[PDB]
Nucleic acid binder design. Structure first.
Lengths: 126, 61, 206, 87, 96
RNA sequence: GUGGUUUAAUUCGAUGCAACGCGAAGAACCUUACCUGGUCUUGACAUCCACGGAAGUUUUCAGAGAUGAGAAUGUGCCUUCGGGAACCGUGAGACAGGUGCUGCAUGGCUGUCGUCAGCUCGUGUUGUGAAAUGUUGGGUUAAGUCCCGCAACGAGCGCAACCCUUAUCCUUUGUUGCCAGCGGUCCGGCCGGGAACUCAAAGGAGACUGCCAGUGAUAACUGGAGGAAGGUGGGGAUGACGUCAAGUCAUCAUGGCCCUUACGACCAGGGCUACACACGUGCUACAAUGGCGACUACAAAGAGAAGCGACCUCGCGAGAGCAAGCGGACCUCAUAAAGUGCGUCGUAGUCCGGAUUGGAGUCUGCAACUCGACUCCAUGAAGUCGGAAUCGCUAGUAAUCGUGGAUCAGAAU
């Protein structure tokens, strides 16, 4: 068995890799069940595709907080870092994609004097 | 009333000396007073702003 | 157009505060008001002495008050007489038993707060400023330092129209939040009008 | 150009008793001389009698009456209204 | 086995007193589990620097309350005698 | 908010953009500066002198208040040889004050083109000179970006970088976290226990166009690999030589000018919330990712003494009546909203949408008719994406929903 945390926005999804069929359990619920009807649910199992696992590995995820998206990206990183423990050599390839990495873009209150707390109020052509 | 302000009467009625309450000195409000100054909550403020109360100062932040 | 106060922008770095004391929500006011009230007299009664600063520290119910003067001789008075007068008269302001120190300042030329007074003083009288500044800037540069700049707006030379003299030497990076540049500001009363004096003293990078 | 800010004038006498009857509800009609006082909540439901200069008239205080002076509900003069005085 | 938590506002006056309590106990008593920093609860206030205009100012202030552990085990008669007597720190609140 | 109109008068300033919840970051006597009426004084505030009783406290009469009148408890302290410091009151003398005008007299601070961006200097050369050249010409580039030729050669601010928040990782620490791992478990980390993980804090590591292909004199541009992110990865604070003689002398400071029984002071009462019309700026107006009904799972930063207010009871209620606890990283404000699971609906004015209105009623507040919040009870429209026009936005962003805080006794769309 191997463990993989996984961070993103404000969600934490622990990943427990266990050699088996290929089914995963998201909060005592199947993958399709939890992430029911969501084109993004696929990106969650992307890291398992590169190194080609899934059909060889069974996972047990435990996420909490944030939204499905943040969870999807959370489980991802968790699975990626979890694959590292199984075989460090996987890093050389898995890393290439960019799964062994979280992400900022953490929502921030729209700063005043601006609009997106990021974009400043442009000026009408000089 | 000038009658209600019977507190001024040193000698209380049938009740023991404990009958004597307080009564404000400026307005005469028995509701909320301040023993130290003997003035009501509405007088201690008006007297504070005027500065007539020595040593007293408005707390800031 | 202006530039953020140097002393106030580098407070987080190399530039201590004028008063350092623990927190106190309900007493934060009284103390400050007291710290500002004590400066009032320390800014006048201690004029002729080149008052650079007036650090302040407040324990439980006391205060040190360390006034840094160029010539403590006048601050101390004859065989220590003025200091006794101050500590007493100041006590009237706040019943709280206050202390008093007179740490001198080695060569005022390095202290901006003093370089400003030297300029205004000459201006208050009647003398070519370009000379005063050219000299002051030279003094602070002579004694050492790495940079120095002086400025004076108002009606220079009693001219009808207001002007702003410049001149400077060395390096005076105001943008470099680290330079640790000692700033100053000395007013100046005159028959033709008021005039402010600004001098910058850059000493060391760190 | 009315004005009261935060300093309403309520004769300290007609204000202390009106509060005394608050111990347990209200008290029967009372009588006051100084009409300069202003009507307020505590005097709701009670029946204060203002002095018109000759006698005391019962003025049933109401929430809608709050704010106005007792003297406003106590007519000084007396106009018979020489007529069928209807409505 | 006596735990001594030292809390205060000033960071320096703590290191002075804390180190003292240790050194003095390093002789008579054990070597102590060593004085650690521990988490410090902080309170910050964001108020505008300038009084007029400049809403984007608001400098940052903070009143920290540092803590310590020390913890002196295997206490001896003299181990305490070197504590009850010497006590300099004034802004430090001891808790034995 | 303003013009107009009106009124005895409902203060003043601001006014195309750089006026109009703008200064009042909070006007029901105070603040106000307005008005009628009554009334005082060295007096609301500063310094000082002489003087009999003099510090101080508590009451009475009259009154709208103010004010006036009047009555009664009584000194330590610096020294006795004589006195004498202090505060205070009266009489008397010398004197105070002003947001009252002018920021085209000004300092300071700030806004604006601008955070846009270049702006300048030394020397040589050209002109009698004010100045010009230097930054012209050819090819090129996002750019004076860089060469070739070249009266020009170099240099200092601006940009950029330096700081901080949000990510990659690492080191230090952990009563935040978690059977990740084991044990107990009222199975609530709760506990034992341990620091991996999350998180908290500090420091440090990382892109520099270095590598590959194309173009080019070069810079650099374009494509590509590697890479967590790249050509200032995403953002704050910050706004130059100088402009408009920009805003403010009611934040403050300041030159000049202008008032001292009054354009000073106290107090009661009457408002700032007048119209036949005209205008500017805004809010309410009309579902079905939007929302609604139920259920359920996560955050951070702050606040609380008469105040935050658990819980109970009345109300499809606000909030009451009652009332525990904390004084607060141990009680409360709190429910985080959304999400997650389920259901309703698909354009029919149909419990969809909730305006408007009637009745009842609690409360904050000395008051809430004009100015309230909320909601019990009933009514329940405009709509099925709405005339001429017009505004914000590009990835977790738009639109949309809810919460906290600064100002603050208290009305914060």
């Amino acid at each position: 068995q191997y463990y993989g945390t996984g961070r993103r926005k404000s969600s934490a999804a622990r990943v427990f890799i266990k050699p088996g069929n290929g089914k995963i359990v998201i909060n005592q619920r199947s993958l399709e069940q939890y992430f029911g009807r969501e084109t993004a649910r696929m990106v969650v199992r992307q890291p398992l595709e590169l190194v080609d696992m899934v059909e060889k590995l069974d996972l047990y995820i435990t996420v909490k907080g944030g939204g499905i998206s943040g969870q999807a990206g959370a489980i991802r990183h968790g699975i990626t870092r979890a694959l590292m423990e199984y075989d460090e050599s996987l890093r050389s390839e898995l890393r290439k994609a960019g799964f062994v990495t979280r992400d900022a873009r953490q929502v921030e209150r729209k700063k005043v004097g601006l609009r997106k707390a990021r974009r400043r109020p442009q000026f009408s052509k000089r | 009333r000038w009658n209600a302000v019977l507190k001024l009467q040193t000698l209380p009625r049938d009740s023991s000396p404990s009958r004597q309450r307080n009564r404000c000195r400026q307005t005469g409000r028995p509701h909320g007073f301040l023993r130290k100054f003997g003035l009501s909550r509405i007088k201690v403020r008006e007297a504070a702003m005027r500065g007539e109360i020595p040593g007293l100062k408005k707390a800031s932040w | 157009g202006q530039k953020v106060h140097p002393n106030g922008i580098r407070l987080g770095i190399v530039k201590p505060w004028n008063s350092t004391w623990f927190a106190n929500t309900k007493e934060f006011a009284d103390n400050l008001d007291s710290d500002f009230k004590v400066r009032q007299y320390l800014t006048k009664e201690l004029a002729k002495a080149s008052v650079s600063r007036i650090v302040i520290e407040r324990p439980a119910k006391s205060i040190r008050v360390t006034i840094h003067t160029a010539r403590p001789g006048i601050v101390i008075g004859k065989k220590g007489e003025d200091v006794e007068k101050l500590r007493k008269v100041v006590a009237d302001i706040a019943g709280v038993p206050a202390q008093i120190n007179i740490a001198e300042v080695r060569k005022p030329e390095l202290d901006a707060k003093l370089v400003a007074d030297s300029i205004t003083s000459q201006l208050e009288r009647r003398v070519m400023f370009r000379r005063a500044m050219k000299r002051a800037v030279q003094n602070a540069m002579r004694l050492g330092a790495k940079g120095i700049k002086v400025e004076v707006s108002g009606r220079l030379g009693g001219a009808e129209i207001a002007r702003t003299e410049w001149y400077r030497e060395g390096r005076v990076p105001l943008h470099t939040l680290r330079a640790d540049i000692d700033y100053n500001t000395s007013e100046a009363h005159t028959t033709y009008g008021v005039i402010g004096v600004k001098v910058w003293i850059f000493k060391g990078e760190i | 150009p009315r004005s009261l800010k935060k300093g309403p004038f309520i004769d300290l006498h007609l204000l202390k008793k009106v509060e005394k009857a608050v111990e347990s509800g209200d008290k029967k009609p009372l009588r006051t001389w100084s009409r300069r006082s202003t009507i307020f909540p505590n005097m709701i439901g009670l029946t204060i009698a203002v002095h018109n200069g000759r006698q005391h008239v019962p003025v049933f205080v109401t929430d809608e009456m709050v704010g106005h002076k007792l003297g406003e509900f106590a007519p000084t003069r007396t106009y018979r209204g020489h007529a069928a005085d209807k409505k | 086995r006596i735990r001594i938590r030292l809390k205060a506002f000033d960071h320096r006056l703590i290191d002075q007193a804390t180190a003292e309590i240790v050194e003095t106990a390093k002789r008579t008593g054990a070597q102590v589990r060593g004085p650690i920093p521990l988490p410090t609860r902080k309170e910050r206030f964001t108020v505008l620097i300038s009084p007029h205009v400049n809403k984007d100012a608001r400098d940052q202030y903070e009143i920290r309350t540092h803590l310590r552990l020390v913890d002196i085990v295997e206490p001896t008669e003299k181990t305490v005698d070197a504590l009850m007597r010497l006590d300099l720190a004034a802004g430090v609140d001891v808790q034995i």
